[PDB]
Ligand binder design. Structure first.
Ligand SMILES: *[C@H](C)[C@H]1/C(=C/c2[nH]c(/C=C3N=C(/C=C4\NC(=O)C(CC)=C4C)C(C)=C\3CCC(=O)O)c(CCC(=O)O)c2C)NC(=O)[C@@H]1C
Ligand SMILES: *[C@H](C)[C@H]1/C(=C/c2[nH]c(/C=C3N=C(/C=C4\NC(=O)C(CC)=C4C)C(C)=C\3CCC(=O)O)c(CCC(=O)O)c2C)NC(=O)[C@@H]1C
Ligand SMILES: *[C@H](C)[C@H]1/C(=C/c2[nH]c(/C=C3N=C(/C=C4\NC(=O)C(CC)=C4C)C(C)=C\3CCC(=O)O)c(CCC(=O)O)c2C)NC(=O)[C@@H]1C
Ligand SMILES: *[C@H](C)[C@H]1/C(=C/c2[nH]c(/C=C3N=C(/C=C4\NC(=O)C(CC)=C4C)C(C)=C\3CCC(=O)O)c(CCC(=O)O)c2C)NC(=O)[C@@H]1C
Ligand SMILES: *[C@H](C)[C@H]1/C(=C/c2[nH]c(/C=C3N=C(/C=C4\NC(=O)C(CC)=C4C)C(C)=C\3CCC(=O)O)c(CCC(=O)O)c2C)NC(=O)[C@@H]1C
Ligand SMILES: *[C@H](C)[C@H]1/C(=C/c2[nH]c(/C=C3N=C(/C=C4\NC(=O)C(CC)=C4C)C(C)=C\3CCC(=O)O)c(CCC(=O)O)c2C)NC(=O)[C@@H]1C
Ligand SMILES: *[C@H](C)[C@H]1/C(=C/c2[nH]c(/C=C3N=C(/C=C4\NC(=O)C(CC)=C4C)C(C)=C\3CCC(=O)O)c(CCC(=O)O)c2C)NC(=O)[C@@H]1C
Ligand SMILES: *[C@H](C)[C@H]1/C(=C/c2[nH]c(/C=C3N=C(/C=C4\NC(=O)C(CC)=C4C)C(C)=C\3CCC(=O)O)c(CCC(=O)O)c2C)NC(=O)[C@@H]1C
Ligand SMILES: *[C@H](C)[C@H]1/C(=C/c2[nH]c(/C=C3N=C(/C=C4\NC(=O)C(CC)=C4C)C(C)=C\3CCC(=O)O)c(CCC(=O)O)c2C)NC(=O)[C@@H]1C
Lengths: 65, 144, 158, 159, 159, 160, 158, 161, 160, 159, 158
């Protein structure tokens, strides 16, 4: 299946946290093609900015597969 | 609190934190924090540890190298065949949904509105649909 | 965020108390508000048709829909119309808000990059947005249309 | 294809292909040559199948080719026939693949959404596919027809 | 069985059986009568297959039947042979089922854990199954042997 | 389970190797199999219509659909047709399998209790199942119909 | 994906119905298929041994296993044999499929970069893959070996 | 869960009483026993696999249960039974360190009877296995530790039965 | 307690206690006898500690014991002293446990809410605890005082 | 990791058993240990003040705190002092450990990138770290200060 | 021990507790004694391994039998080398005061490594037990108890 590699930065505007949040704040992740749409929305809602999106696996606009 | 159960968070990824010194450490360390979390995943999703064939190493690998995050590891376990075999296939569809709910979201369902939402989804898209809906729920995202 | 909050935020960075000039901008928004609410209701009711008409204007009867085109296959076609809906809903939100920021925060953020990786054509998408604008303009009526147009244009430029 | 499906199940389980799965692959490779011929037959008769099915459909559903109806008008009628042709091409692909997956990606996912935007009635489209099946069945030999029928039925089920 | 496997996949997808899935069922029902005969042959030769395989295994692995080894002693050697018999019975069940699922539930899940508690070496058990395969193959006709081989191979792979 | 597995399981608890008597039962299933596959394909293709026809026969044009009836309101109507689809899909599965067990394990278990809490009328549901059976019988043809009927009857008996 | 689907996909982008030339390619695959299935079953049964033999040929009794070597420590040793298993399983999948793409999609993508960060030696890994190929070649037999070899070589080149 | 120290505290807290000498004595008793318990726990953890093996050999295996038609017949069921045995052992070890039976009630004992009855697992055989584990454990831990270990094993057995 | 914490971590991991965890248990059991003495000392001096701390608090905060203030009046002043006594009892429990958990469950969770309903000022309560610490420290030997201080500090941290 | 583990790891790659020379390095660490523990206790007790003093020296009474500055608004102010506390806590951990690695693994990795996205000014942060070092140096006393300073400098260089 | 304390503190996001600090102090004092215990075993290492090897073989003839993995000079040497490795790890553990050093080098992936080798894991465990008994005899009672814990852990791990 097609996979997305996504790098995004998310700020905690509602509350300050004592524990390290660096993993939460800045993450590079692999997302299934389908899941990415929902994930993109989640980052947007959080108010985080998506620095980079790349298609890790699969071929641009393959008709089937 | 101490009134609660223990909560596991993955604080750091070892994979991307390539040692700046003594690359071939041998003793390394902080491997356990990940390896403990992996054990605790299985304890929450399945309740028990799996048998020797049954575990899914590939998902574990990615989590260890920091390719995926904890969210995605949990996704892989819910999607897994063994999870379907243990909980989806043997039960009445509503009994299934109720049990799956408690494993993935950590509570019983509140109301007929939730139950119906998942029952509907189950009829259009089956076991896969139900599990995705729970993990894609905003409730999931807020708490976990 | 919103026109009201935008004014507030601009003043807050200056540290200035709210002043008459600022108040006038807020007052301007308040008059426009009633029109915007009416427009939003119109758009929501006619949303499915708006998308249909816009697709007919630009997307269908085109190379995109023909085999080897981006919108060829049912899956791709469905994706494109879903995206069109998104743009419409967010534009409606922006019109009520009176601020382009929400478009930047949700719609403009990450979509360009996604599209470039996918190889979706930006110009065709822009064409679709412009088509939606034209259809929307008719339904909302002239006073509302001017307001609606700016948000559609903002999306297109992004 | 059948093969792709088998591989995918194995990869999910993270195991080598099961004996049963392997057996199904063996059966498929034997069947393939016959399947190729069935597909070839339909391709040659494609133009006539579409034409015949179209006026069966229009007779069955007068409304679709009526001023209210989606199909009405030359442009629209052509598009309706184009769609029937598309589905036939997909069916041929399916027969050679031995599985509906190739068909499914191109034609069955998002189909409802696409047609709803178009406003085309989905049941009428299904009737057209059924019509095509009947024409195709006549040209095919009985056993060949049964194989082709399965793929045709899937399409009708999907929409 | 083949059919159970197909149904289960469909239920997960919440869809009716795919044409491809249906085709595999058709092939299986045709194959079944031949499969029954293959199973019958092995059942009749069961006693000899186990005996011959046991001897081969013990020759291959002297250690298992040695004072240190698990198999050593009459009681233990009997149990080792009983295990071989169990696996043969499972293989026959598999052939009639057309799938390893029946085999898998009874024999392959938790097998590692069971044997580790017993302290029986898993590789030796695998060798015994391989030995049984060779004996079984000789009695079976070539095509029959190939079918039987797949099930035997699965067992060896599983442990 | 399925017929083949049921035979296997009975033998496994005994520990017995498969015997001719067992083989005969398996052989019986294998002959029926081809018919069943054809029937299943028919049902899948005509599933939407089957439900429509069955509803027409029993559920609609009735007090249920009229205001104050259980199937009144779009939400309730949609629920009832969803349930009908479930029954059809599972019956098709059972027919292929040759075993009623799947119906017990998924559909039948807890249904009565669910319905009683909901206040759904069991007798009307049973009526709908019987109607589906009749429609299905026509499409599948006589040989297939006998096999199809038993699973439909099994569902009906369970609900009652 | 697979050979059959590859042909289909190329035709689908063209929009062309399947033609005799296409059919011939499919027919070619169908003849090879039976051989491939037999080979796959052989590999699955002998997988553990194949890995053992290949390790014996290249990996063990070496500096790698000695302290300061990449495969030193139990954890690293286990990782290396796990990787070997992966390569074998995916090569078997590719051989059945008749297509190299699955190797690219799962194994090959990002592996070089991962290995470089880890400091795993690529040449040694390639050596291990080639060793597995040789062992596999024996078991599968000559006709099957040619088909098996190309996928192993594909992994090595990647 | 609760431990001996916390149990004393809780009893006093409900009374509202400050800790008194009698209470102190109970705490002191625990503290002396503590060192022995830690040693016992380490012994059990190291020999856990063997303990289970020996106990199974004594009761479970070479029996109708393992024979076809028995509850522990088939690999899957065999594996399940030894997993359950391990649970009992681990929890008993936890209880022994704690000096309180409560953890057994909270985790193991609650709903076990009902679960087993639905499953059709035989309770008496399970109890037999627990008793067998106790005997094996007693040997390894040594006499002083054995008395302490035995009570928790007996607690599990009584709960199940 | 230390022991409870260790067991809980093990059960989450579903493993036997780690050597490191076992070592911590060993250390705790050795420490316990010393801990018991520290607790005993404070219990005996409890009455004086409370009295002295109360006086200090009232000097520090005249307002609380004033006609406006919550503490004012004999009944109210008694209740304020009772509260101080409660917290001291909790501290003793903490020392024997070797963890703040015993203290935390009884006294620190919902404390804000309880006092807000009562309208008692939380900072004043904190001052009283600080005062008690100073008195307690004087009676305790230096090393003993440090141990006791940690528990006292936690309370002060919890309440603000 | 730790000084003790560092020695062990160096020996493990060589495969050498621990030797007197290695023991001497371990012994060296053990002598320093007592001093480190005292320093750590001092820092923990005075942590709030250390942060206050350092902020007073660099962060406050500045454009940052004024509107339009990075540390303007309560939320941002609180974040900045939270970051300062992190640096202090980790430096204390490093000092006890005798190794800079923990700083690299937790604090230093990805901080630059995070700060750049946030728009936090790195140079000002570095200034704050240096200020904390100076305050810490006083409290800990001279012998402890040298050890403390290296970890603070390490953080500063990383940022 | 120090690493463990720091890690717990970091999870809690707090400065090290007084009790935790005290344990660190105790550990540094104990270290010199620990070094001596380790030194003793290092000197006796060659004999401990040899005796334990031979002791184990008496129990289990099968392991060193023509079928068995250990059989033959090359194989027997490798088995003894493994025992030596584990002893070295134990010494490292004693000086560290924690099993972590032991655990990373020897106990993670051990099952997988030995399964590929086909070495029986229980026999390896027996060898470690044997080494413990030899080591205990040379050590003084209190020293032996300390050493025993590390030995027991290894046995528990595999
Ligand atoms: C203070 C000297 C300067 C300053 C700080 C500042 N930081 C943030 C926000 C964040 N900073 C961090 C940093 C860390 N999180 C970690 O886990 C670690 C490693 C242990 C560090 C050092 C992160 C992740 C954030 C984002 C979310 C969060 O709250 O943690 C802000 C807020 C800026 C914003 O708009 O989000 C500020 C102000 N900036 C200054 O003005 C000082 C020079
Ligand atoms: C339609 C006007 C054009 C078109 C669209 C198209 N998009 C995708 C795939 C994705 N689109 C997004 C991004 C967004 N769409 C939104 O509405 C929003 C929120 C405002 C976002 C962020 C994403 C994330 C995807 C991929 C993930 C997913 O689909 O779940 C496709 C599919 C491409 C493909 O299948 O390869 C298409 C076709 N393309 C056209 O032809 C029009 C010009
Ligand atoms: C004929 C059986 C029925 C019918 C058809 C009809 N279709 C259109 C327009 C389109 N149909 C498609 C279909 C596809 N695109 C794909 O990618 C696939 C899968 C390979 C299919 C099947 C598309 C994209 C269009 C849009 C126009 C275009 O070709 O670019 C129409 C006209 C549109 C309209 O009605 O407004 C019609 C009439 N309508 C019926 O009622 C028949 C029963
Ligand atoms: C023979 C090839 C190898 C061997 C076997 C061996 N097995 C046992 C004991 C048992 N074996 C089983 C296994 C099964 N029970 C099941 O339900 C199934 C599937 C149907 C299997 C395969 C069981 C349960 C036992 C326990 C005792 C009992 O039968 O009740 C032994 C002896 C007991 C012991 O190991 O102490 C042996 C020797 N041992 C070898 O080394 C051979 C390579
Ligand atoms: C008229 C605008 C369109 C139309 C209508 C149409 N409806 C039916 C049959 C039914 N429609 C309903 C709908 C409802 N029942 C409810 O409870 C509610 C909400 C309160 C609604 C909207 C129902 C239940 C039926 C079934 C009959 C029954 O209730 O007993 C038909 C006839 C179809 C049939 O086969 O019976 C028709 C024609 N048809 C169009 O195309 C018009 C645009
Ligand atoms: C249709 C013939 C009859 C009918 C049906 C009806 N059902 C519901 C609601 C539900 N139906 C179910 C049933 C199932 N759950 C399962 O797990 C399975 C087996 C796979 C089935 C069959 C469920 C769970 C619901 C409840 C959903 C909810 O919470 O709303 C309704 C709606 C009841 C309501 O009040 O919404 C109806 C109408 N009713 C009739 O009168 C027909 C005879
Ligand atoms: C063995 C032939 C050689 C070798 C192997 C080795 N690999 C690692 C670590 C990793 N290798 C991979 C690779 C994969 N992960 C996948 O999912 C796939 C495709 C399915 C592959 C091929 C990854 C991601 C890792 C990361 C760490 C992990 O365990 O997951 C190591 C360990 C490196 C370390 O120091 O941690 C080793 C030793 N290296 C050799 O020496 C052989 C030549
Ligand atoms: C007056 C009612 C009380 C009082 C106030 C006081 N404040 C300071 C110093 C600062 N106060 C702030 C506060 C803010 N910064 C923000 O961004 C916001 C939100 C918009 C607020 C409210 C800040 C950051 C400072 C630091 C100085 C600076 O801005 O650069 C002081 C000075 C203390 C000192 O000398 O250190 C005082 C006195 N103090 C009282 O006692 C009054 C009750
Ligand atoms: C002796 C107790 C048992 C035994 C041992 C045995 N081992 C091998 C081969 C290897 N064993 C290891 C072990 C390690 N490497 C490590 O890094 C560590 C952790 C520090 C260990 C313990 C390795 C890697 C090998 C491979 C050889 C090499 O290192 O180059 C053999 C030979 C098997 C072979 O195929 O070569 C043997 C015999 N075998 C028994 O039967 C005893 C019970």
């Amino acid at each position: 299946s097609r996979y997305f590699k996504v790098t995004a930065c998310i700020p905690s505007l509602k509350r300050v946290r004592t524990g390290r949040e660096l993993q939460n704040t800045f993450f590079t992740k692999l997302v299934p093609y389908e899941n990415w749409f929902t994930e993109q929305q989640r980052i947007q809602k959080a108010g985080g900015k998506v620095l980079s999106v790349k298609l890790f696996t699969g071929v641009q606009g393959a008709n089937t597969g | 609190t101490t009134l609660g159960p223990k909560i596991f968070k993955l604080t750091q990824n070892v994979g991307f934190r390539s040692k700046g010194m003594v690359q071939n450490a041998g003793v390394v360390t902080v491997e356990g924090s990940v390896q403990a979390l992996i054990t605790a995943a299985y304890q929450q999703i399945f309740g028990r540890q799996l048998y020797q064939g049954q575990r899914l190493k590939v998902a574990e690998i990615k989590l260890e190298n920091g390719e995926t995050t904890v969210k995605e590891f949990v996704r892989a376990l819910g999607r897994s065949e063994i999870f379907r075999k243990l909980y989806w296939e043997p039960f009445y569809v509503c009994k299934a949904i109720e049990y799956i709910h408690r494993r993935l979201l950590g509570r019983p369902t509140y109301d007929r509105v939730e139950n119906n939402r998942y029952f509907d989804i189950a009829s259009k898209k089956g076991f896969y649909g139900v599990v995705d809906a729970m993990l894609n729920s905003n409730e999931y995202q807020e708490v976990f | 965020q919103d026109a009201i909050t935008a004014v507030i935020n601009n003043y807050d960075v200056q540290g200035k108390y709210l002043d008459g000039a600022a108040l006038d901008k807020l007052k301007a928004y308040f008059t426009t508000g009633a029109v915007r609410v009416r427009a939003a209701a119109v758009i929501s009711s006619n949303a499915t048709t708006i998308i249909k008409e816009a697709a007919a204007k630009a997307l269908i009867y085109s190379d995109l829909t023909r085999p080897g085109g981006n919108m060829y296959t049912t899956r791709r076609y469905a994706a494109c119309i879903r995206d069109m809906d998104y743009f419409l809903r967010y534009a409606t939100y922006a019109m009520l808000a009176g601020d382009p920021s929400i478009l930047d925060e949700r719609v403009l953020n990450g979509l360009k990059e996604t599209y470039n990786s996918l190889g979706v054509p930006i110009a065709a998408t822009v064409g679709g947005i412009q088509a939606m604008k034209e259809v929307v303009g008719g339904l909302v009526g002239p006073d509302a249309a001017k307001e609606a147009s700016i948000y559609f244009d903002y999306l297109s430029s992004g | 294809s059948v093969l792709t499906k088998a591989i995918v199940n194995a990869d999910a389980e993270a195991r080598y292909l099961s004996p049963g799965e392997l057996d199904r692959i063996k059966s498929f490779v034997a069947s393939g040559e016959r399947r190729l011929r069935i597909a070839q037959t339909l391709t040659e008769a494609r133009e006539r199948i579409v034409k015949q099915a179209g006026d069966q459909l229009f007779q069955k559903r007068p409304d679709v080719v009526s001023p209210g109806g989606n199909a009405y008008g030359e442009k629209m009628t052509a598009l309706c026939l184009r769609d029937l042709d598309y589905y036939l091409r997909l069916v041929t692909y399916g027969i050679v693949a031995g599985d509906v997956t190739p068909i499914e990606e191109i034609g069955i996912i998002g189909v409802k959404e696409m047609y709803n935007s178009l406003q085309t009635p989905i049941p009428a489209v299904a009737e057209g596919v059924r019509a095509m099946k009947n024409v195709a069945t006549s040209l095919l030999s009985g056993d060949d027809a049964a194989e082709a029928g399965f793929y045709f039925d899937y399409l009708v089920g999907a929409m």
